A paper describes a structure:
To investigate, representative Group 2 and 3a enzymes RbCuZnSOD (OUV78940) and BbCuZnSOD (OFX46851) were purified recombinantly from E. coli. BbCuZnSOD has a typical eight stranded, anti-parallel, Greek-key β-barrel core structure with two long loops incorporating conserved metal-binding ligands and coordination geometry. The BbCuZnSOD E-class dimer interface area is 747 Å2 comprising N-terminus, C-terminus, and disulfide subloop regions with a PISA score of 1.0 as opposed to 0.2 and 0.3 for human and bovine SOD1, respectively. Strong hydrogen bonding is facilitated by conservation of Gly150 allowing close contact between opposing Gly51 and Ile151. In addition, each Tyr14 forms two back-bone hydrogen bonds with disulfide bonding Cys146; β-barrel interactions that are conserved in human SOD1. Immediately adjacent to Tyr14 at the loop I N-terminus, Pro15 replaces a glycine which is conserved in 80.5% of eukaryotic CuZnSODs (Gly10, human SOD1).
Crystal structures of a [name] CuZnSOD portray both prokaryotic and eukaryotic characteristics and propose a mechanism for self-catalyzed disulfide maturation.
Author numbering:
A (entry chain AAA): 3 to 153
B (entry chain BBB): 5 to 152
Write the structure that this text describes.
Amino acid sequence: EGKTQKAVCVIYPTQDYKVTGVITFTKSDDGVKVVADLNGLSPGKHGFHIHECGDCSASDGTSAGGHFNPEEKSHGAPMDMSRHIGDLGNITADENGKAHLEYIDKMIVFEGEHSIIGRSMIVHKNEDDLKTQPTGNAGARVACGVIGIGK
Amino acid sequence: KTQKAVCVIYPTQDYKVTGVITFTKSDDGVKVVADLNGLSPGKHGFHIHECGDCSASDGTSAGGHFNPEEKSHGAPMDMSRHIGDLGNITADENGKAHLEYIDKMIVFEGEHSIIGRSMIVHKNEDDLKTQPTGNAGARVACGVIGIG
Ligand SMILES: [Cu+2]
Ligand SMILES: [Cu+2]
Ligand SMILES: [Zn+2]
Ligand SMILES: [Zn+2]
């Protein structure tokens, strides 16, 4: 009955990677709180997006398809107005390969045309430069996961 | 409208159960096709659970059977069933398990939408009688149902 307040996504690695972690999307007053904790990432910034298809059956994560863009807008940063619904920018891994990230996304929701429920999270090998189209030159996909309804 | 749904199941702690499940919209109902590996030989409980959360080691985070009508536990062919009562999946001597059938209850939009819910494979058989689980026991694999 009660509208969806939480969303959870466990990312598993693509072929020839050890990238794993959990991402929670919690509803707050002024948007949706994104909290991500990953391991097995190479040190540095990694592309971090919601993709249109919730399919992680492919070895290379190609089955996730393109960036979740139901408004047919350009690729950008989370802070940008001109962005895809699934433009969550970059996640940064430390020297130990641990990556934490928490911020308030004002675009994502858990119901309607722009619902992220049943979509995929994709972590990329390289940095999302937030300029290049349509991907940000993030390159290969190192981890995939499907966004599910939380409690 | 969403025509297809896909769910990759990964194992819980101390299990090797993996596979892919597709839900395709067909004449009559929704065609369920499941291909699993690393299951013990025999029948295994096979359900859609209310929470799409596989973050727990033992798959407890998936919660109970997806039951938005507050009905009793039953078989897929039964009228008195949970929306996520997909019965049992059977693994051969090699631990491979295939299963295809037409479910007339599951849909990809509305109150009874399976999109964003979890698939759970159990250690033991779902007897389709015992409440509320069918005495299926421990959870060996978890996965979230996504849009195809
Ligand atoms: Cu991406
Ligand atoms: Cu179950
Ligand atoms: Zn994008
Ligand atoms: Zn049930």
